[PDB]
């Protein structure tokens, strides 16, 4: 298996796994991974927390 | 009348720098030219192919027949006849502006002044509408000349309540994107415009303003956006 | 009348024209009474306009820009030569109008040091030595290199003139067209009335 690749794809493409707020917002674990890809090598967690909050 | 062609230093104009830094001469010279054109030749796929096809036809000799047919169609003017037309235009007519054109000139320039260009710059636009009126031989310069003149001025000088919405986007993006993070232009469209948090024009203007305020950097023709500063 | 506002500058011009009072001492010393004014900021913003009025209004106004030291000679057709006067010397009991003061040379600066402080010129040349009175009031305009004035800093870094030269000006004013659109409309309407 592409063990590393499958996790990344599941984190990104959640619709390939999952089949009234449930209809709109994806799970946080996959959604937070989007910011992780966009993030720098080192993270100011307070800024990351604010950035995560703005998307909710 | 002076048409000056200048090669910017470092060979290529760096968009990271102010035009003053990409220039080696006296800064007061920038206050002399009515317009400047920082042309760019960023690589692209479909535009290059269309341009390349044009070049091949010229060396093929097809352009000779194409231009003559276009001259026959009237879409193109002979170089001698155009010179005869220009000489006729210069000697005969001398237009003067209309209040409708002038009042829009003041209003738009006020918005330009408030956002920031000197008082001299607006009067340079007066020449352009006079020039377009001269070509049409109209007795008075018209506001419909100014629209292209303003667009040309914006596309020349700006080479490098809606403002509140634009600045709010700057405020919002400074929270969404921490310093050092990267994203894409289409990502902002899907997250901020498709959700209707801000208008697309505000997106365009905020990105335009943020780059000049050293906040962000646009990369790879918009495929990557990186926040450079606070 | 062509400048809106700038009341202190206009007041300064009136005071510079009036001037002070000179004094003499039993020891043989003399006291300067005249006043100098300096203008700084963006080039085209109201500096050439203010200087134009003062130069045209004042009875003994001399225009200068960057032979003013009056320490050079001009020869006749037969070879004999005579000194030519300079604006600083000619403006004795008058006023000196300077544009592009930043553009003047260092030779001018070292000569004007005694002019603004001691009101005299000590000429020391080969075979020619004399002292000429230079009791002239000085008004000058200067611009920063970048064209846009950094209001956060003194002209000592925006223009970089020597502090000894700058200290010789009694009054200094910095003007820059900070835009208030409704206010700039009021002054530009008269300009638009000329178009």
From Swiss-Prot, chain A:
Coiled coil: none annotated. Disulfide bonds: none annotated. It is found in: Nucleus. Component of the origin recognition complex (ORC) composed of at least ORC1, ORC2, ORC3, ORC4, ORC5 and ORC6. Interacts with ORC6. Component of the origin recognition complex (ORC) that binds origins of replication. It has a role in both chromosomal replication and mating type transcriptional silencing. Binds to the ARS consensus sequence (ACS) of origins of replication. Belongs to the ORC3 family. This is Origin recognition complex subunit 3. The lineage of its organism: Eukaryota, Fungi, Dikarya, Ascomycota, Saccharomycotina. The gene is ORC3. The chain holds residues 481 to 548 of 616 of the full protein.
From Swiss-Prot, chain B:
It is found in: Nucleus. A motif (Arginine finger) lies at residues 31-34. Present with 10300 molecules/cell in log phase SD medium. Early fractionation of eukaryotic MCM proteins yielded a variety of dimeric, trimeric and tetrameric complexes with unclear biological significance. The MCM2-7 hexamer is the proposed physiological active complex. Acts as a component of the MCM2-7 complex (MCM complex) which is the putative replicative helicase essential for 'once per cell cycle' DNA replication initiation and elongation in eukaryotic cells. The active ATPase sites in the MCM2-7 ring are formed through the interaction surfaces of two neighboring subunits such that a critical structure of a conserved arginine finger motif is provided in trans relative to the ATP-binding site of the Walker A box of the adjacent subunit. Belongs to the MCM family. Component of the MCM2-7 complex. The complex forms a toroidal hexameric ring with the proposed subunit order MCM2-MCM6-MCM4-MCM7-MCM3-MCM5; loaded onto DNA, forms a head-head double hexamer. Interacts with CSM1. This is Minichromosome maintenance protein 5. The gene is MCM5. The chain holds residues 518 to 775 of 775 of the full protein.
Curated annotation (Swiss-Prot), chain C:
A motif (Arginine finger) lies at residues 167-170. This is DNA replication licensing factor MCM3. Disulfide bonds: none annotated. Component of the MCM2-7 complex. The complex forms a toroidal hexameric ring with the proposed subunit order MCM2-MCM6-MCM4-MCM7-MCM3-MCM5; loaded onto DNA, forms a head-head double hexamer. Interacts with CSM1. Acts as a component of the MCM2-7 complex (MCM complex) which is the putative replicative helicase essential for 'once per cell cycle' DNA replication initiation and elongation in eukaryotic cells. The active ATPase sites in the MCM2-7 ring are formed through the interaction surfaces of two neighboring subunits such that a critical structure of a conserved arginine finger motif is provided in trans relative to the ATP-binding site of the Walker A box of the adjacent subunit. The six ATPase active sites, however, are likely to contribute differentially to the complex helicase activity. The chain holds residues 369 to 569 of 971 of the full protein. Belongs to the MCM family. Present with 35100 molecules/cell in log phase SD medium. Early fractionation of eukaryotic MCM proteins yielded a variety of dimeric, trimeric and tetrameric complexes with unclear biological significance. The MCM2-7 hexamer is the proposed physiological active complex. Residues 1-192 form the MCM domain. ATP binds at residues 41-48. It is found in: Nucleus.
